[PDB]
Amino acid sequence: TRLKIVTIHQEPFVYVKPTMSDGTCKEEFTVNGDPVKKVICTGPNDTSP
Amino acid sequence: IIVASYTANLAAFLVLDRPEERITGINDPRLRNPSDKFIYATVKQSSVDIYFRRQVELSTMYRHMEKHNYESAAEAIQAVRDNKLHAFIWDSAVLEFEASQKCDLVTTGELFFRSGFGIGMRKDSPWKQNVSLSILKSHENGFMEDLDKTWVRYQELTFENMAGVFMLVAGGIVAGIFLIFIEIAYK
Amino acid sequence: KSTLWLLVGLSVHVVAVMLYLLDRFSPLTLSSAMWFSWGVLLNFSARILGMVWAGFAMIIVASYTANLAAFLVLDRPEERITGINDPRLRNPSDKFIYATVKQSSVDIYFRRQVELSTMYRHMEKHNYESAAEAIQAVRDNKLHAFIWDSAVLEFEASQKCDLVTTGELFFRSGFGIGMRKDSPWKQNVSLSILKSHENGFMEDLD
Amino acid sequence: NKKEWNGMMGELLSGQADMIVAPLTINNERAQYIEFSKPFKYQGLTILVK
Amino acid sequence: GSPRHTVPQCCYGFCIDLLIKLARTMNFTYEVHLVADGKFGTQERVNNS
Amino acid sequence: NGMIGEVVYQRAVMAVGSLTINEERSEVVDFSVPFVETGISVMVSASVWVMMFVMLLIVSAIAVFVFEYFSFTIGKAIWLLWGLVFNNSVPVQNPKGTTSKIMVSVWAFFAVIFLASYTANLAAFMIQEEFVDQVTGLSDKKFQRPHDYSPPFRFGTVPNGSTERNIRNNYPYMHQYMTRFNQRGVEDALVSLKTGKLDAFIYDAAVLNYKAGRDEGCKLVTIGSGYIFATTGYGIALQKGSPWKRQIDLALLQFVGDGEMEELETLWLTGICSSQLDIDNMAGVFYMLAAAMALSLITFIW
Amino acid sequence: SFTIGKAIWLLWGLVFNNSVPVQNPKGTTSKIMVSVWAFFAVIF
Amino acid sequence: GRDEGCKLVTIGSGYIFATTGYGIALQKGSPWKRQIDLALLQFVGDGEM
Ligand SMILES: *[C@@H]1O[C@H](CO)[C@@H](O[C@@H]2O[C@H](CO)[C@@H](O)[C@H](O)[C@H]2NC(C)=O)[C@H](O)[C@H]1NC(C)=O
Ligand SMILES: *[C@@H]1O[C@H](CO)[C@@H](O)[C@H](O)[C@H]1NC(C)=O
Ligand SMILES: *[C@@H]1O[C@H](CO)[C@@H](O)[C@H](O)[C@H]1NC(C)=O
Ligand SMILES: *[C@@H]1O[C@H](CO)[C@@H](O)[C@H](O)[C@H]1NC(C)=O
Ligand SMILES: *[C@@H]1O[C@H](CO)[C@@H](O)[C@H](O)[C@H]1NC(C)=O
Ligand SMILES: *[C@@H]1O[C@H](CO)[C@@H](O)[C@H](O)[C@H]1NC(C)=O
């Protein structure tokens, strides 16, 4: 039932934002009032160099 | 007839001719034998690299684009913004959205290797038929148009050479003020 | 190988009369003021409206220069074929009449090429005997194209300037002397041909 | 002297991942080893300049 | 057009003077005549056999 | 019926020919990988004046200075100034001051280079070929009702098609308005669009692109490039459980992944395809002269 | 007062849009001819 | 055709020049001559050249 999902940091497709207070997101709207339902992902800051 | 010839050669200078900043796609012979003036590469370890590696008529560019392989596409954006590049190979709609972001980033006219983005999947698995049926159900309704409304569809004077002439006209007026006061002192 | 000017003329024939009425309403002379308006549109609020109309006259003559430049510089009549890669000849019609000499090398050369079978089926209803028949037919505009070698067509272009060739040069071939089988007149006759090649006798024949 | 994979395919084939939901360029060689789904996005290649 | 009219006329030009140069080079006499029809020649089926 | 009736009932092996892909066709058989992008389509038939005003006031102030040194051309120098920009040769005033002659000569040199640059601007506007459209989407207000706009137009598809099923599963009222507007043949609809027995037509994308690439005159013009459309692909249909499917998919990926597919598309497509018009500019001319006579009627109160 | 044949200096002088004063035209035939010639000079 | 900016310009298109051709050098009396000649005539007269 739990599916491992992995992706690459695509610039117009995968937007990564730091946490606001503690493991949370900022619920913002689009230009048409649609709230962007974010997801809690886990990843590194940059590459190995 | 002097000012008619001047109108004619200014129309020759700024209308008909053009500095060929464009490449006209992959079939540019000057990029078939590149140099240090034509700095162009792609993302390191991509499918486009293997696609150009299989084709034997794209080996020479494969000998060139291997010199400056970049990790991410944002590295290529920062390099071509800071004039470290001259051309970049990438897909269409991402560059269209970034052209909506930055107006200086302009694509070219040609379009080749019409490929497709999907979802990377495993071998024989129960997540094969139902997932593809869900994708086709997303294709058949207006959800793809809504996805285009999220990111794809949502986008974001004549002072060329005679502006300096206009500034020299203004400076000539300023100097002519003192020249006319000297002419007033003359008579 | 106009009406908008009439509308502007009717407009200014209204404008000059109403500006003379404006000048009369604002405190020999009639025709003189009309002639002054004639000198206004062509080489005191009425003077202000007249100088605004003079600005309109400059933008009208600038638009006239601009659209005559559109009329003769950028546009080009589609009278060219640009060689074998023309979709007019890949998909012919009733007004696309192209042929060659009947029972020539063009027939076999387009009969081997199976993708050129459309021209093979088209020219077989139009093949003529001699090239002079082709010249006489294309002079009366019965033809539209003619697949032929370069030298004869360039010589007839020097004769008749309306005969214009195209840009592409395909199937670079060679013309020699028709010779028999094994014979002693094959070797040193060809050596004489090569001796004609090495000197300026080809230039003399040019 | 053995050929392997890395990146998303390296994490997938090692069992560390189970479903690569990513806009990956679907090509010949990567489908020779694993099965792919039908693509959602369709676009070609082009050149970005300044 | 022509029931029987085959006459000797005058011929000159490019290939004629080329053959005159060849006859100046190689030692031979000649017999210049013309082709009967107006065709090059194709490998076409004769109507019998 | 058709190829689905031949393949599913095991009278045919596979559908090598072209076929639209939707839900129930993917339910009955298993399609291959796509090879061509074939969606659906609809075929149908502010700084110059400010600085010139500032320099106009500067020229008028210099003329006032010349008048203060040395007949009524205090504010009437503007009538000589902007009037002789346009070189229509209106008799205005003969100045005696050398200052005014030098200033008007510099202004006239600026006017000559300004008119030359304006002819260059008109040529640069004359370079471009503008593109106009009538319907800009599948959700058009024209598509709601043809009585809503002044021409009652007409739209058609091919009969018995999967596009009709997609419309009936997307917009049943569109099928209701299409029921009065049916037709039979693709080339019949082509002749109906050319002669004028049809206004717009709804079909797939690349087939109409091939028909427009071979058409005389290039009058029928597409709308967009698959942006407000279905944007699907074509593949090969095989029976469910066929062992040859993976090898056919690898063969298609080899045929696409070498540039040979682009050569085949180049072989089987065609990549082909005035007078005076200033009616918007002339309408602006008439509107500005109407505003000018309105301002004159305002100033007539004194 | 001097427009016998001196109007050539107004004819070919006002072809070129020079804004230089030359002569005051008085004949109606002269003014109509100068208007037609001025349109001819603009198109020329 | 590979010139940087088309700086060097040719003269003519073979008019007051030698106007010769290229061939395959074989030995005198070689049996492979006719086969290579017919192969070249096939390679030119099909659009492959
Ligand atoms: C030129 O053509 C003639 C006739 O085919 C040949 O000339 C003879 O060549 C042989 C040598 O093979 C000499 O011994 C003879 O003296 C030549 N002439 C005579 C009198 O027969 C040969 O084909 C060519 N020879 C040259 C000079 O190139
Ligand atoms: C997957 O698809 C089949 C066929 O439509 C259906 O019977 C089944 O319930 C679906 N669910 C699964 C197993 O994910
Ligand atoms: C040659 O042929 C033409 C056409 O058949 C004929 O009219 C003419 O009389 C003939 N002339 C001679 C000289 O035989
Ligand atoms: C003419 O033929 C004779 C035959 O003996 C030969 O010797 C001579 O070389 C020839 N002359 C020319 C011009 O070839
Ligand atoms: C045989 O018939 C064909 C039909 O085209 C014709 O072209 C050919 O001239 C005929 N052969 C002879 C000997 O006339
Ligand atoms: C569409 O299908 C119907 C049967 O449902 C048939 O009668 C009709 O002829 C078909 N349309 C065509 C091919 O004109």
Swiss-Prot record, chain A:
Domain of life assignment: Eukaryota
Expression across tissues: Detected throughout the brain, in brain cortex, cerebellum, thalamus and olfactory bulb.
Subcellular location: Cell membrane; Postsynaptic cell membrane; Synaptic cell membrane; Postsynaptic density membrane
Post-translational modification: NMDA is probably regulated by C-terminal phosphorylation of an isoform of NR1 by PKC. Its phosphorylated state is influenced by the formation of the NMDAR-PPP2CB complex and the NMDAR channel activity.
Glycan attachment positions: N45
The protein's assembly and partners: Heterotetramer; the NMDAR subunits are modular and harbor tiered domains that function in concert to regulate opening and closing of the cation-selective ion channel pore. Forms heterotetrameric channels composed of two GluN1/zeta subunits (GRIN1), and two identical GluN2/epsilon subunits (GRIN2A, GRIN2B, GRIN2C or GRIN2D) or GluN3 subunits (GRIN3A or GRIN3B) (in vitro). Can also form heterotetrameric channels that contain at least two GluN1 subunits and at least two different GluN2 subunits (or a combination of one GluN2 and one GluN3 subunits) (in vitro).
Record remark on domains: A hydrophobic region that gives rise to the prediction of a transmembrane span does not cross the membrane, but is part of a discontinuously helical region that dips into the membrane and is probably part of the pore and of the selectivity filter.
Family (UniProt): Belongs to the glutamate-gated ion channel (TC 1.A.10.1) family. NR1/GRIN1 subfamily.
Protein name: Glutamate receptor ionotropic, NMDA 1
Gene: Grin1
Residues of the full protein shown: 396 to 444 of 938
From Swiss-Prot, chain D:
Residue window of the full protein shown: 494 to 543 of 938
Domain commentary: A hydrophobic region that gives rise to the prediction of a transmembrane span does not cross the membrane, but is part of a discontinuously helical region that dips into the membrane and is probably part of the pore and of the selectivity filter.
Subunit structure: Heterotetramer; the NMDAR subunits are modular and harbor tiered domains that function in concert to regulate opening and closing of the cation-selective ion channel pore. Forms heterotetrameric channels composed of two GluN1/zeta subunits (GRIN1), and two identical GluN2/epsilon subunits (GRIN2A, GRIN2B, GRIN2C or GRIN2D) or GluN3 subunits (GRIN3A or GRIN3B) (in vitro). Can also form heterotetrameric channels that contain at least two GluN1 subunits and at least two different GluN2 subunits (or a combination of one GluN2 and one GluN3 subunits) (in vitro).
Role according to the record: Component of N-methyl-D-aspartate (NMDA) receptors (NMDARs) that function as heterotetrameric, ligand-gated cation channels with high calcium permeability and voltage-dependent block by Mg(2+). NMDARs participate in synaptic plasticity for learning and memory formation by contributing to the long-term potentiation (LTP). Channel activation requires binding of the neurotransmitter L-glutamate to the GluN2 subunit, glycine or D-serine binding to the GluN1 subunit, plus membrane depolarization to eliminate channel inhibition by Mg(2+).
Name of the protein this chain belongs to: Glutamate receptor ionotropic, NMDA 1
Domain of life according to the entry: Eukaryota
Gene from which the chain derives: Grin1
Residues at which glycine binds: P23, T25, R30
PTM comment text: NMDA is probably regulated by C-terminal phosphorylation of an isoform of NR1 by PKC. Its phosphorylated state is influenced by the formation of the NMDAR-PPP2CB complex and the NMDAR channel activity.
Species of the source: Rattus norvegicus (Rat)
Curated annotation (Swiss-Prot), chain G:
Start-end of intramembrane regions: 4-18
Localization in the cell: Cell projection, Dendritic spine; Cell membrane; Synapse; Postsynaptic cell membrane
Tissues expressed in: Detected in brain cortex, olfactory bulb, hippocampus including the dentate gyrus, striatum, thalamus, superior colliculus, inferior colliculus, midbrain and cerebellum (at protein level). Detected in brain cortex, hypothalamus and cerebellum.
Name of the featured protein: Glutamate receptor ionotropic, NMDA 2A
Residue ranges of coiled coil: none
Subunit organization: Heterotetramer. Forms heterotetrameric channels composed of two GluN1/zeta subunits (GRIN1), and two identical GluN2/epsilon subunits (GRIN2A, GRIN2B, GRIN2C or GRIN2D) or GluN3 subunits (GRIN3A or GRIN3B) (in vitro). Can also form heterotetrameric channels that contain at least two GluN1 subunits and at least two different GluN2 subunits (or a combination of one GluN2 and one GluN3 subunits) (in vitro). In vivo, the subunit composition may depend on the expression levels of the different subunits. Found in a complex with GRIN1, GRIN3A and PPP2CB. Found in a complex with GRIN1 and GRIN3B.
TM spans (from-to): 28-44
UniProt region (Pore-forming), positions on chain: 2-23
Ranges in the topological domain labelled Cytoplasmic: 19-27
Similarity comment text for this entry: Belongs to the glutamate-gated ion channel (TC 1.A.10.1) family. NR2A/GRIN2A subfamily.
Domain of life: Eukaryota
Record remark on domains: Contains an N-terminal domain, a ligand-binding domain and a transmembrane domain. Agonist binding to the extracellular ligand-binding domains triggers channel gating. A hydrophobic region that gives rise to the prediction of a transmembrane span does not cross the membrane, but is part of a discontinuously helical region that dips into the membrane and is probably part of the pore and of the selectivity filter.
Coverage span on the entire protein: 598 to 641 of 1464
Functional determinant of NMDA receptors (site feature) positions: N17
